[PDB]
Amino acid sequence: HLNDTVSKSFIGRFFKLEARKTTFTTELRAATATFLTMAYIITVNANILADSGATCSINGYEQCISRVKKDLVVATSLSAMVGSLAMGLLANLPFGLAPGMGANAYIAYNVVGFRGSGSISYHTAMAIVLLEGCAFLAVSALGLRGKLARLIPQTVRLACAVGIGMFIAFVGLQMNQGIGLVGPDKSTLVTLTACAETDPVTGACLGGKMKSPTFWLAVVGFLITSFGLMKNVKGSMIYGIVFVTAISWIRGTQVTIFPHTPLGDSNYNYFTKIVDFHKIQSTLGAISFTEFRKSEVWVAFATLFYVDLLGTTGVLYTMAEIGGFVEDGKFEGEYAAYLVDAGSSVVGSALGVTTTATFVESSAGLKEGGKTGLTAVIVGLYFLASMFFTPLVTNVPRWAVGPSLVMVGVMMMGVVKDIRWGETKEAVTAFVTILLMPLTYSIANGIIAGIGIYLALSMYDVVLG
Amino acid sequence: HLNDTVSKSFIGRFFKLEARKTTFTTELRAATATFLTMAYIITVNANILADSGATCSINGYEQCISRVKKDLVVATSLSAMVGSLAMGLLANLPFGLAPGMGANAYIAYNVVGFRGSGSISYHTAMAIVLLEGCAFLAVSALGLRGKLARLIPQTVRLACAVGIGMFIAFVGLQMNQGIGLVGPDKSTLVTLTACAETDPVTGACLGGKMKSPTFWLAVVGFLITSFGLMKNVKGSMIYGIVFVTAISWIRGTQVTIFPHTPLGDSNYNYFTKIVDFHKIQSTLGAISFTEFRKSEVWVAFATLFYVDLLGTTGVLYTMAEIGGFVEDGKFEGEYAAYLVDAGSSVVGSALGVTTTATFVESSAGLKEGGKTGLTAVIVGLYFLASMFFTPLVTNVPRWAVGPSLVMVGVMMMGVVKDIRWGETKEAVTAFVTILLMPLTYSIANGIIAGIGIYLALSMYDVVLG
Numbered sequence A, B: 001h002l003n004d005t006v007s008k009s010f011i012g013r014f015f016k017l018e019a020r021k022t023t024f025t026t027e028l029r030a031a032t033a034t035f036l037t038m039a040y041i042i043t044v045n046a047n048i049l050a051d052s053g054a055t056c057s058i059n060g061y062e063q064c065i066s067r068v069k070k071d072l073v074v075a076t077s078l079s080a081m082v083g084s085l086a087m088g089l090l091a092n093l094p095f096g097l098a099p100g101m102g103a104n105a106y107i108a109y110n111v112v113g114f115r116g117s118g119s120i121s122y123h124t125a126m127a128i129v130l131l132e133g134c135a136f137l138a139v140s141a142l143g144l145r146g147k148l149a150r151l152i153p154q155t156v157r158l159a160c161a162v163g164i165g166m167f168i169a170f171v172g173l174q175m176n177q178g179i180g181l182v183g184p185d186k187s188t189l190v191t192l193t194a195c196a197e198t199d200p201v202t203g204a205c206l207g208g209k210m211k212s213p214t215f216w217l218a219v220v221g222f223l224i225t226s227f228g229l230m231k232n233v234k235g236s237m238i239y240g241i242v243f244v245t246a247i248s249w250i251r252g253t254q255v256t257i258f259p260h261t262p263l264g265d266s267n268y269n270y271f272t273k274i275v276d277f278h279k280i281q282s283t284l285g286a287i288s289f290t291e292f293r294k295s296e297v298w299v300a301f302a303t304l305f306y307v308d309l310l311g312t313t314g315v316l317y318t319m320a321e322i323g324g325f326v327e328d329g330k331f332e333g334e335y336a337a338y339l340v341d342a343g344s345s346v347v348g349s350a351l352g353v354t355t356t357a358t359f360v361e362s363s364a365g366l367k368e369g370g371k372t373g374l375t376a377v378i379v380g381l382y383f384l385a386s387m388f389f390t391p392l393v394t395n396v397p398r399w400a401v402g403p404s405l406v407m408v409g410v411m412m413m414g415v416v417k418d419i420r421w422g423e424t425k426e427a428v429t430a431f432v433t434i435l436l437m438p439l440t441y442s443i444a445n446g447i448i449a450g451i452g453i454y455l456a457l458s459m460y461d462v463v464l465g
């Protein structure tokens, strides 16, 4: 009677749990799939921005890097919570707003450079995000984005979704933040280099070729997750992570995360206590409009605004289409939905995380039938759990989210059977968009190429039109 | 009446052009699509084996490299002709046997090394291919391959076909034998580096980022081919090649292939005459069973036999399924079909080209309805044209097959809508097989991973079975 008694309450009527009707047993932990799929962003986003180090400039690792990483974990777990809560409370829609994976490794590497090796610094790197979010507020306010959502052709919009999954899968295979399969080469570009004797500057090999102990633990974790997904276990994407993490927490093995180096007995010294708060102390703020006065920064606002407006608008509409909300070119709550995914970004600058991009992971939740609200709210409430448990989050080895990163791409492939492969006008664009995202290691190079090809081989109908 | 009068002839009854009936206008140049799609192998295969240089050892470029390249063009255009003719004359089936693209950049780089920098030389590199072809003769003779074809699960067999197209597309983007988009990097692995100021050792950039004149000519050639494929032009994959080649043949521009260097006015001195024969003089033979006596060579026969038997058997059956020949687990001519694609390889060693792999390009022909024979025979006869025209074949710039190489992968993607993406057992294997082929730059790493994953997450039903 939990559902029988909750209908006659303001939860039932505010969320409209009588029309488009679903059940709490189909909502409470049948929407945990979204959180268990988006959980990687707590550590993956905090690692990409850590090596950039937008704090404790040249004016090291044991003092500033660790503190910055711990500050960024909380900021990432809070900025996604705020965005998810906003989408759930108003404009009832089951989405998973969180800082995306398309601008993290564009700001941290191309803009600010590795470990501060760049011409643009933090005070003109977060200011760019804040200003572009303010621009998004205005653009969405008058309703331009609402009409612009339908202008993008369907196959480009779907190929972007497939390519994002492929890129997320590819980022989980490198040595930086993955298992460590792919590695560099001279004659070719990428080869299989799961080597035990690695050089701590690149993915090169000194002795190896598939005899590295760490690889044959992420493989086991990936197999457990895959075997648990069949038979329909309620939650398994965390089942394959805890098993690897618990083994890696054992001291003395060759796959440990707690070495005898002086850095190791500080992570281990922190991990001995389970619960800590660790309020943000060195990342909040850090907004300084001072170096805006040259053209170097300005060009890297133009190259970002019109790819972010075009690569994040088409994901919200796609996840609206998959859930079957839009029926006549419109879906309810569109005005508030397109403004929440600008208000979330502004709030983000202040804390120090990058843009929010309406995570394309709500497919997992929608597969189990999340139609009403009370789905983003549950995700947000779950996100107020990986900020009370920072010692158990910042201490997960990087060879534990790889199995959970490849499975994102595996899941985000069932939509490739909707693209029109019969035609030749409508298939070249989709293939180019799918292919250019992983091999160029940037999502910004996939939307632009697809738009440029689709716009080109139609101009004969435009000039004559 | 050309068809009305040819039915009452031994062509009509030997090829059975009354049952499974088709028409000559649907056969003669509605099967030219297969040749116009496989035409790249005349120059791409001759370039991969050229840098290996299995002739004129250290005991240079202007004398031995050019002669070896010209010798290999004829050998490649002849070995594919023999195989295609054999498949057409007996066991009527419309296929396109030719030396594959999976072993060329495994023998030339990993086995023999770059420019002879390896522990295995030519006389134990072609001998391996000859011996493995002799083994294929025996294996196919008693009928083991016929029963082994059906043992491979369907989704693995289809994901291999998709991944081969993806790998062929990826090989057309690098600096070596493609447009020149992708290039190396330090922090990441692959980036967009269409640069004008390239270093002639890698794909690095000194000045560039999409201002290289050569790139914005392969793009134009790709657009012409794409615009010609729509509207159903009889032949357009050669339309987009001749346009680029004719422009590149003009002397004095910055996109020429005839520089003022001493090497240039030897290619130009050859090109001044249109027709030449150039019988093979330095590649035929070169079989010496001498260095077989150590274990280094033996391991690189074992790592090749059981991936070649598993990655070439599943393509023949797949192209039999697409044409709708098999109806009860069997298709006519199976015994001769599985022996032709071993006899073709033996004949291949002697000339100096690598294994034959039943080119997966017959999809283009089958789309226009090639059901009977007289399709491989026409392809073979067309292959006795790019040996009477060597000066116009060896002088095509490498930035002209890139548009024709990416389109192979574009075409070989419509079969991805047959794979069962609904299940989770049957989709992880397909995604892994598709993904591991391009990013690892080897087809041998895709079949093995797919088989290893599919065999693993089914053993619970095997032990209990």
Ligand SMILES: C/C(=C\CNc1ncnc2[nH]cnc12)CO
Residues within 6 Å of the ligand: A100, A101, A102, A103, A164, A168, A307, A308, A311, A312, A315, A357, A358, A359, A360, A361, A443, A444
């Ligand atoms: C479009 C851009 C970033 C979007 N990134 C993402 N957009 C949507 N879903 C995701 N899941 C992980 N990363 C993402 C940058 O142009």
Ligand SMILES: C/C(=C\CNc1ncnc2[nH]cnc12)CO
Residues within 6 Å of the ligand: B100, B101, B102, B103, B164, B168, B307, B308, B311, B312, B315, B357, B358, B359, B360, B361, B443, B444
């Ligand atoms: C299976 C292997 C090579 C097969 N290569 C090819 N197999 C089938 N079709 C093709 N088209 C281009 N290359 C190929 C090596 O294991």
